[PDB]
Design a protein around this ligand. Structure first.
Ligand SMILES: Nc1ncnc2c1ncn2[C@@H]1O[C@@H](CO)[C@@H](O)[C@H]1O
Ligand SMILES: Nc1ncnc2c1ncn2[C@@H]1O[C@@H](CO)[C@@H](O)[C@H]1O
Lengths: 329, 329
C-alpha cells in the first residue's frame, strides 16, 4: 500500500453502559447440574450510567495518554455529547457514523463481589458499523500504524478485518466481548495475520473451544498473543513460544472491572507505538488497567504523570518507571 | 384470628420488564473452569418492554381467571397506568404503596435459544414494600383465604411472612426469584408453616443448597411442596411422601418463558380456591403456564373458555377438561 502514512484507528462499539452491583457471588448461585439451562435473577444494589463501548473506551485512553487516535464506529443521533467528551481528550471523531434512525447501543452489566460480570448488549446503531468503509478513513487521514478490531457489529468485525487485509494495514484482533455471539467460523476468519491478538484467559479458552484450534494453530497465524490473566497479570507470547509475563499493579480498591481490558490494551499499544519493548508496554498497560479498576465506569480515571511514575516504581522498580514516563507527555 | 373473612392477597414485586433474546446458547458460553468467575456479555437481537413483577403477574392471572384478588406491593408514581391495566382484569390495587420519590422496579432479562434466562432486577420503589403492613390490608378487606409471599424486597418477604404468622393467615412461600439474593438464614425463616412452597427444580436445589436443609427438613414444616419441572411438568408433594405428578400442556411455540412460573401458580391456586383437587389444579395451572410460554411478556395472554377446554382435553383427557371448565366463569 503506497498511500501516505499517519495514528491508531480504533474500531468497535460506542455505547451507553448501565453498570449495576450484585452484593453476592454469581458462582455461589451457579449450580453445575442446572448449567444446561440457567434461571438466574440478581437483585442489584446500585445502577449507574457511564460512557462506554470498547472503541469509545480504547480511543479515550489513547487520547488521555497523548496518542493520536481516530474512533471508527456507529452511534445514534444522541452522539453529539459523547463526541464532545471524547474530543476533549484529543479523540478524532470525524469517522463516527451517526445513524439517522437508530439509538446508541446499550450495555447492561451486573458485577458481583468477586468482580465476575454478566451482561447484555443491545446493538441499536452499532449494527450500522457494517456500512463504514475503512478505505474512506484511510483516504482522509492516511494509513494508521495500527487498526484495532474491537467487539462491534459481528459483520463489521469481519468486513473491517478484510479491509485491513486488502489495504495492508496492521491490525489487532480484539474480539473479546463478542466471542459469546460469534460462531467458530466467525472467530476463525478474524485471526489470520494479526499483529496482536488480545483476550483474557477465559476468552482465550472460549476462542480455542469454539474455533476447534489448538494454541499452535493460532500462534502460526499471529505476530503476538496478549492474554491478560486477572490478578496474575498478563502473558505476551510470540510466534511459537517466547513468553514475557508482567504481574498486575497492586490495586487499592476493586471498584468496577468494566473496561479494565480496554485500558490495558490502550496503554500497551501506546507503549508499543512509542518504541517501548513488550515488557515495558505491558507495565504501562497494567497501570492504566488498575486506574480503571479503581474507578466506576470505563472513562472516569485520570492522568497525572507524577502519581504514574510513583506507582510504576513501586510495582516494577524505578528503571521501568523512568523508561515509561520518559517516552510520553 | 376472629376477624371477618374475605380473596387471595398477592405480595411481591411490581415492575417494568425489559426482555431481550440472545440468539445463541448460554450453556455453550459457560465454561466450568471459569465458573469461579464468569465474564459474560451477550449481544442480543431484540429488546421489548412489558408489565411485570411476580405479584403483578400472579394478580393479573387470578383476575383473568375470575378470582377475587388484591395486589400488595410497592411501585413508583408512574404506577397509575399499570393500575388501570390491572383493574381492567378485576385486580384490587387499593393496597399498592406508591413511592413519593422512587421509580418502579426494573427487570432486565436475556433469554437464550434453550429458554435459559439471565437477569438483573433493580428494586427502586420495591424497597419500600417493607413499610406495608398486611394488618392494614386485612383490616380493610377481611382475612384472605391465602397470602402469596412472592419475590419482593428481601426484608418485606420476611415481615410479610411474620405478619401472616401472627395474623393466622394461610400463606404460600414463593421466594423463587429472590433465592439468589437471600442468605440461607433468610430463606429458612420464610418456610415454616407454609400451606404451599412453590419453586422450580433448580430453585429447589438452590434452596436446599443454601439452607443446609434436606428435603425431609422442609416437608416437616410445610403442608405441600409444589416443584415445577420445566418440560417434565410439576411435582405436588405432601408432608412426607405422597407425590402427584402432572406433565406439561404441549406447547405450539417456545416464545418467552418469563412469568411461566407465576402463571402456573395463579392457575393452580385459583383451582385450589375452587375446590379442585391437587391434580386438577395443577392441570389448570399447566394451561395458564403454556399460554404464557406462547406469548411475549407475562400478562399478554388471553382467556377463552372454549379453547381452554379443547387443550385440556387434548393433554389430560375429557374428564379433566370438563371438571376444570365447570368450576369457573
Ligand atoms: N457484546 C458486546 N459488543 C460490543 N461491545 C461490548 C459488548 N459487551 C460489552 N461491550 C462494551 O465493552 C465494555 C468494555 O470492555 C463496555 O464499555 C461495553 O460498552
Ligand atoms: N429478583 C427479583 N425480585 C423480584 N421480582 C423479580 C426478580 N427477578 C424477576 N422478577 C420478576 O419476576 C418475573 C416473573 O416471574 C418478572 O416479571 C420480574 O419482574
Amino acid at each position: 500500500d503506497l498511500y501516505f502514512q499517519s495514528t491508531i484507528a480504533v474500531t468497535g462499539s460506542i455505547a451507553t453502559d448501565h453498570l449495576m452491583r450484585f452484593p453476592g457471588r454469581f458462582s455461589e448461585q451457579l449450580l453445575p447440574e442446572h448449567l444446561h439451562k440457567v434461571s438466574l435473577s440478581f437483585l442489584v444494589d446500585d445502577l449507574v450510567m457511564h460512557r462506554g463501548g470498547v472503541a469509545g473506551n480504547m480511543a479515550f485512553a489513547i487520547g488521555v495518554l497523548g496518542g493520536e487516535v481516530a474512533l471508527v464506529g456507529a452511534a445514534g443521533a444522541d452522539f453529539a455529547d459523547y463526541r464532545d467528551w471524547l474530543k476533549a481528550r484529543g479523540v478524532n471523531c470525524d469517522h463516527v457514523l451517526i445513524s439517522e434512525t437508530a439509538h446508541t447501543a446499550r450495555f447492561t452489566c451486573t458485577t458481583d463481589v468477586d468482580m465476575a460480570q454478566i451482561a447484555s448488549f443491545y446493538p441499536g446503531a452499532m449494527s450500522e458499523a457494517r456500512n463504514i468503509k475503512l478505505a474512506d478513513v484511510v483516504s482522509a487521514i492516511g494509513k494508521p500504524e495500527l487498526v484495532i478490531i474491537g467487539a462491534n457489529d459481528p459483520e463489521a468485525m469481519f468486513l473491517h478485518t478484510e479491509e485491513c487485509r486488502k489495504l495492508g494495514l496492521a491490525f489487532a484482533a480484539d474480539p473479546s466481548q463478542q466471542l459469546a455471539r460469534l460462531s467458530g467460523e466467525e472467530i476463525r476468519r478474524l485471526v489470520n495475520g494479526a499483529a496482536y491478538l488480545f483476550t483474557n484467559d477465559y476468552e482465550w479458552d472460549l476462542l480455542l473451544s469454539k474455533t476447534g484450534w489448538s494454541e499452535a494453530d493460532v500462534m502460526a497465524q499471529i505476530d503476538l498473543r496478549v492474554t491478560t490473566l486477572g490478578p496474575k497479570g498478563v502473558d505476551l507470547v510470540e510466534p511459537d513460544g517466547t513468553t514475557i509475563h508482567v504481574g498486575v499493579v497492586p490495586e487499592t480498591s476493586q471498584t468496577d472491572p468494566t473496561g479494565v481490558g480496554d485500558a490495558f490494551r490502550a496503554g500497551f499499544l501506546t507503549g508499543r507505538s512509542a518504541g517501548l519493548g513488550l515488557e515495558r508496554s505491558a507495565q504501562l498497560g497494567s497501570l492504566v488497567a488498575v486506574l480503571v479498576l479503581e474507578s466506576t465506569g470505563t472513562q472516569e480515571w485520570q492522568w497525572d504523570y507524577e502519581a504514574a511514575a510513583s506507582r510504576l516504581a513501586g510495582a516494577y522498580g524505578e528503571h521501568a518507571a523512568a523508561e515509561i514516563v520518559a517516552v510520553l507527555a
